[PDB]
Amino acid sequence: GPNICTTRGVSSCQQCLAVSPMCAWCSDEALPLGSPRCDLKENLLKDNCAPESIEFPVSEARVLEDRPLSDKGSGDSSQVTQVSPQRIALRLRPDDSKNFSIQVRQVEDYPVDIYYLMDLSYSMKDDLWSIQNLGTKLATQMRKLTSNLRIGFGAFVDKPVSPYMYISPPEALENPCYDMKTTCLPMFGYKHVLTLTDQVTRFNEEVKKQSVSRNRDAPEGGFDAIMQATVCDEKIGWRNDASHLLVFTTDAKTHIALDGRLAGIVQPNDGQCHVGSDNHYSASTTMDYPSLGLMTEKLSQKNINLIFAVTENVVNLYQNYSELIPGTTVGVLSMDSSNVLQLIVDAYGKIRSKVELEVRDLPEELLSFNATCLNNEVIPGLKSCMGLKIGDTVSFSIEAKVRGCPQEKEKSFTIKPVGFKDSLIVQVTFDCDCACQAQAEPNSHRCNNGNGTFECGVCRCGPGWLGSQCECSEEDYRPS
């Protein structure tokens, strides 16, 4: 017996189907008229209204196109595929639901940003090839690990003020190395050279075009370069999504905060961006060197991993400095670039990624995801797996529960993992209609000019009307 289907009222095939999917509509004379056409499926099957006269839809979730997720990101063999199925068709009912699976794989390489500060004081002239080789292989070996890389350039000597720079002869003021009968450039401070760009050749070949300066005191002002490379996002060109690495080169000790007192520079560092239109650090001679705590704060605030590339004679000093900068590392600036490329690889190996799902074009009538994450955690409720790595897979599940029937038949909605070049859409389609009355026969003379709705073979008469064609009146119908 129908607990719902018939007890909520029966008026037409469309209204009959407006009830939950548990109900169907019969339109044949194969059984007596003891109950409306909306008897429940258990009654429909046994009473067995004619098979050709049953209006019983079933939701269909079918793949429209499903190109499998690629296991390689190489362009020589694939265009990569990150979400599947790309499009699934959905036949729907105004109160039905059906399972709809979806899958994600991280295939495209992680974006990286490696910026390279240069020590160009006269101290470095003895091993300039070391720093140049390091700058070259930073690019060349990272192109061998990731295809989404951007590299930049910068230099530092020291604040162009006494007692750091030779102001004494006019010759020295434009060629400090005069006193040694040799030529070298005037002192910079800190000056940005090449903005972050993907052109390896330009950076690789333009590294070789830099040369040394000279200052007096052994400590060099590299910390100002650190602070300005970190905080000047526009000039540097840091990219929001990419992993940021900063490689800092130096051969000697470092000017730490409060060392600027000797030069009359008693203004604390503030971390603002001061690189000018000429790409020089304007406040180089106005602002003291930065504090390790301030450097750590600004280095974490902008997600930078700093790697010290220093020579064998200062490794211990900078290691001990490293522990005061939590998260920093350090390597030898030997003639061969080893032990700093290792730190770069190790940094790449720890940048895990997130897979969040966002939806657009989704109408109000249609579910929240249950996320199955790595290590086969099948957790309901959660819809955003974290800690993923390239080559891994995460699976999501959703069912298209319906809240009603919309204005028209055809709609769609698009799902997209955040930050992915791939996405999928469903051409969701709702079958609220019925084929019985589409024949235009209703309200004809065969239904007594509209005294009943045509069931595609028999007229369903309204109150006060009776007969297959509504040719009789209930008030006049009497025993005879």
Partner 1 sequence: FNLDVDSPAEYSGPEGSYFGFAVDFFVPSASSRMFLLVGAPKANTTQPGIVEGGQVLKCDWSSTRRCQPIEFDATGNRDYAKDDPLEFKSHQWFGASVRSKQDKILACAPLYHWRTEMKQEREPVGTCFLQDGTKTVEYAPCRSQDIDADGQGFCQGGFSIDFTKADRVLLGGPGSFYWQGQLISDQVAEIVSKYDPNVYSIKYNNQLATRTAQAIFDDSYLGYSVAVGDFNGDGIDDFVSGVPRAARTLGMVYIYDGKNMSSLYNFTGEQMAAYFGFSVAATDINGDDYADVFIGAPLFMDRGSDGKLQEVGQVSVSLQRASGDFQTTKLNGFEVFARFGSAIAPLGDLDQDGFNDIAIAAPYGGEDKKGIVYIFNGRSTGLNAVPSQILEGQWAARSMPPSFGYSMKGATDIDKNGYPDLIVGAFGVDRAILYRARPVITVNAGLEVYPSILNQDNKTCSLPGTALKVSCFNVRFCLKADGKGVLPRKLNFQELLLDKLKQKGAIRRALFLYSRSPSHSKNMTISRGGLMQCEELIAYLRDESEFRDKTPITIFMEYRLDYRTAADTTGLQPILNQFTPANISRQAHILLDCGEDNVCKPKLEVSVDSDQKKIYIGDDNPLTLIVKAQNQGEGAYEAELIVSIPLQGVVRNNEALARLSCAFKTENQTRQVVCDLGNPMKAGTQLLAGLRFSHQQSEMDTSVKFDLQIQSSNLFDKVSPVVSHKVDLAVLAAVEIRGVSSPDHVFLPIPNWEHKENPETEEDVGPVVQHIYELRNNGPSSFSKAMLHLQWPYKYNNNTLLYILHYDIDGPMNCTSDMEINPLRIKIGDIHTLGCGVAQCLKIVCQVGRLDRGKSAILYVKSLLWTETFMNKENQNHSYSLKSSASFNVIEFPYKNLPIEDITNSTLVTTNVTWGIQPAP
Rounded CA-CA distance 122/213 in Å is: 5
CB distance 339 to 332 below 8 Å: yes
At closest approach, how far in Å is the CB of 323 from partner 1? 9
Angular region, 207: left φ>0, alpha ψ -120 to 50, beta rest = alpha
Give the one entry of ligand A1LU4, partner 1, none that residue 253 binds, where binding means its C-beta sits below a cut-off of 5 to 8 angstroms depending on kind.
partner 1
Q: Is 28 exposed, middle or buried (0-12, 13-18, 19+ CB in 10 A)?
A: middle
Give the one entry of ligand A1LU4, partner 1, none that residue 215 binds, where binding means its C-beta sits below a cut-off of 5 to 8 angstroms depending on kind.
ligand A1LU4
Residue where the block lists tokens 């989704």: 362
Give the one entry of ligand A1LU4, partner 1, none that residue 123 binds, where binding means its C-beta sits below a cut-off of 5 to 8 angstroms depending on kind.
ligand A1LU4
Q: Is 158 annotated as belonging to a binding site?
A: yes
Structure tokens at 44: 């429909």
Closest to partner 1 by CB, 184 or 424: 184
Positions in the binding site for partner 1 (CB under 8 A): 162-163, 167-169, 216-219, 253, 256-259, 261-264, 266-268, 291-294, 296, 317, 320-321, 324, 326
Positions in the binding site for ligand A1LU4 (CB under 6 A): 121-123, 125-126, 214-218
Give the one entry of ligand A1LU4, partner 1, none that residue 167 binds, where binding means its C-beta sits below a cut-off of 5 to 8 angstroms depending on kind.
partner 1
Q: Is 123 annotated as belonging to a binding site?
A: yes
Closest to ligand A1LU4 by CB, 171 or 241: 171
Closest to partner 1 by CB, 319 or 423: 319
Burial call 72-95: b when 16+ CB within 10 Å, e when fewer: ebeeeeeebbbbbbebbebbbbbb
At closest approach, how far in Å is the CB of 102 from partner 1? 39
Closest to ligand A1LU4 by CB, 27 or 215: 215
At closest approach, how far in Å is the CB of 213 from ligand A1LU4? 7
Rounded CA-CA distance 82/359 in Å is: 16
The single-letter DSSP state of residue 410 is B
Give the one entry of ligand A1LU4, partner 1, none that residue 140 binds, where binding means its C-beta sits below a cut-off of 5 to 8 angstroms depending on kind.
none
Q: Is 336 annotated as belonging to a binding site?
A: no
Report residue 208: phi and psi, to 5°: -65, -15
Q: Is 278 annotated as belonging to a binding site?
A: no
Closest to partner 1 by CB, 57 or 268: 268
Closest to ligand A1LU4 by CB, 12 or 215: 215
Rounded CA-CA distance 135/204 in Å is: 7
Give the one entry of partner 1, ligand A1LU4, none that residue 293 binds, where binding means its C-beta sits below a cut-off of 5 to 8 angstroms depending on kind.
partner 1
Closest to ligand A1LU4 by CB, 61 or 263: 263
- DSSP string spanning 315-369? HHHHHHHHHHSTT-EEEE--SS-TTTHHHHHHHHTT--EEEEEEEES--TT----
- Among 73, 64, 62, 149, which residue's Cα sits nearest to residue 107? 73
At closest approach, how far in Å is the CB of 162 from ligand A1LU4? 14
Bridge partner list, 349: none
Q: Is 121 annotated as belonging to a binding site?
A: yes
Which amino acid is residue 352, in one-letter code?
A: R
Q: Is 171 annotated as belonging to a binding site?
A: no
Q: CA 33 → CA 18, 30, 252, 294, 479, distances in Å? A: 22, 9, 101, 87, 18
At closest approach, how far in Å is the CB of 291 from ligand A1LU4? 23
Give the one entry of ligand A1LU4, partner 1, none that residue 256 binds, where binding means its C-beta sits below a cut-off of 5 to 8 angstroms depending on kind.
partner 1
Cis peptide before 94 (omega within 30 of 0): no
Q: Is 219 annotated as belonging to a binding site?
A: yes
Structure tokens at 462: 């309204």
Q: Is 422 annotated as belonging to a binding site?
A: no
Residues contacting 316, CB < 8 A, separation 6+: none
Question: What residue numbers does the annotated binding site for Ca(2+) cover?
Answer: 123, 126-127, 158, 215, 217, 219-220, 251, 335
